[PDB]
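Re: UKF structure - here you go.
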Amino acid sequence: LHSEIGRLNNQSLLWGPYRPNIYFGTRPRIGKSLMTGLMWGKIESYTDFQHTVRYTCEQNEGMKGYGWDEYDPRRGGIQSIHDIQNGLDITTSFVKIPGGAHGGSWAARIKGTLNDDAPKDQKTIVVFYVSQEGENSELEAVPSENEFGYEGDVILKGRSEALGNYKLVVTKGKGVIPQSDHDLSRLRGPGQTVVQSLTYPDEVLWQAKPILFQQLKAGIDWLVENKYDVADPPPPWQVYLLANKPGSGNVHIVQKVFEGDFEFDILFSSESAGKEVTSKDLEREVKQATEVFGERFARVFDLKAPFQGDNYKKFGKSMFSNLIGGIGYFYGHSLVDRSYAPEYDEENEGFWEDAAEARARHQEALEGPYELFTSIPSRPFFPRGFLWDEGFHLLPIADWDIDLALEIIKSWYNLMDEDGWIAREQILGAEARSKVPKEFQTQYPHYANPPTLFLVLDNFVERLRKLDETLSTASVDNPEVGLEYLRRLYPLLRRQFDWFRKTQAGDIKSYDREAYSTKEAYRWRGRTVSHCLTSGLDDYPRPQPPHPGELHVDLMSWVGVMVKSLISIGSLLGATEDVEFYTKVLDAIEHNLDDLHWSEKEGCYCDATIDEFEEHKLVCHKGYISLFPFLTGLLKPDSPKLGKLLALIGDESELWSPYGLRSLSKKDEFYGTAENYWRSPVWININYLAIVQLYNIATQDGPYKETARDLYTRLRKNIVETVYRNWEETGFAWEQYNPETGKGQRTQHFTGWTSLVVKIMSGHH
Ligand SMILES: O=[N+]([O-])c1cc(-c2noc(C3CCC3)n2)ccc1NCCCCCCN1C[C@H](O)[C@@H](O)[C@H](O)[C@H]1CO
């Protein structure tokens, strides 16, 4: 029965607008298959369209904003795009229609409305670009009756092993289509929908912009050769209209020019399903998906006081939809240094210079292919999987649809190599690579990242202990399906745990170091003079200079998170021998957190190094790092140390701002220095962990119950209101927030763990 859910999940999830790197496109969860994408741009001159055309996501002064108003990857949703440059408010509605054997059907409506500023007679070029990869697959544009192009719909018929037979229609649409009275119209037509059917080697089909422009340039070259010139030139929009040439190929460009408002549909009909998809079908499924979305949100994300107001519901729906709407399918080779150069063991003083030397060998090479199905932090700036980010992304998503979240965990775990490594940053295929400087592509098998995905697993486990609707919870409602999932994953979890212990081990046994355990001690590999990227907290201050005897309290805590998870899941599976080992590791981490990292003098946890004199030294820098054993759920509720941390947490002159907790204390000498990334600003992911843990102390008999209850109340309020106010003013989720001004800063469209705010509002942890 397990593989029954599995099959239904696969069929449910296969199609999606799973290209969050572009404004709008579709692809299925198959490496080499059919992909679509949308392009549009005003044209007002002979040279403007190249600068105005939109395709890949960006965020600059020319774009007011854009994002998903509703979305569920099983059903589809609606996206809004507000484009200042092209004077256009666009809606793209996408809906899936279950059926047949090939993952069903889908449909999209593209609606564009000129805004108030745009010339009412604006000419907007619109392209629907379709490509198919695979050796034994075919796709063909049925030619038009009319001479120079299409008066009605464009029908592509295609076939592949993966999709069986299918038709993809781009409808005639509604809106004025301009008409040219130039001489050229005798050869090019007065103006109509056109199709070019082309073929290129499979691996470049993703390069839609250049492919398109190469075609436009050949049309213009043809104008020149054929005596169309500046003495009497055709209008711009006709100069940029491709000559109609439909046929068969692995690329099909469908182009329309509109004057004023426009709309058209795309209907993908799987032959193996019922009858084919119509526009009436699209409208009906669109209405139905909203109703369903509406009802799930109010049940799953029931906002509690003082956020019950409709303004906060709208806010929550925006933050949620953007997070789950960023879900992508990525496919291809990634770039990995597999030298395991000895310099990467970072055993010497000065190891960062050695490691640079090894990086200068450039032994990295492409490997795979791999696939990933994942949510992403940022459509415009980093539309790809990041390992500890996904732990945060899946917490609201798991509420919504636990089976989807397990899907994404499974996809991430399927990347793990034989040693237990998963690269922190998944840049799959040339399309993904295009967005990323060559110097930052290389992944390193010695680089860890926080195992925040175990948090999602912990949530799953609690739920397991205590048709699209049915499917979304199948893995918790069917206990045996749940345990079977956990059974197949468990070895990989254990693999990762061991990998942490082998690759990120700290050195106790060879300095003057006394502690309950000789084993438990950890140091993040990959540290430079000013950075520790693998920790997730890029530039939070660490011992200077970096040193092979460093120990990092955040890393030990993460290992604590992992043991606790392995205990639960191990118990569920009866791995009795494993559970006893874990039990002793936990007990050891508990003692060793204190013996190696507790500072009585400072009242908080600290990273440690070894002195110029060769002795163990704590290096205390009050901020997120300092609260780690607390944030990761490792302290007993009665713990005096906890109490001291609650004081640090609440102290306005250290961490507590009106806007959330400061990454670093105002008292720290590194406050607001250098790039100031993790050296003062307020970060929603760490604030979320604080909030969940405060709530935990607050809902149990103990000495800090009422302190935690007050801090919980205030911090929930602070964090939610800061994120909300910024969204209200700017339309955006931001990456971090300024503790002096409350302004969002760094990157916009960060959905992205900022969206945790929906879970903070809905509460009851
Ligand atoms: O495309 N870009 O090169 C690019 C461009 C801009 C940019 N800003 O403005 C503009 C112009 C002017 C207006 C438009 N461009 C900003 C960033 C990037 N790329 C950075 C790649 C790595 C990001 C990691 C984020 N984050 C760090 C955290 O610390 C980790 O913890 C966490 O895991 C990780 C993932 O969330």
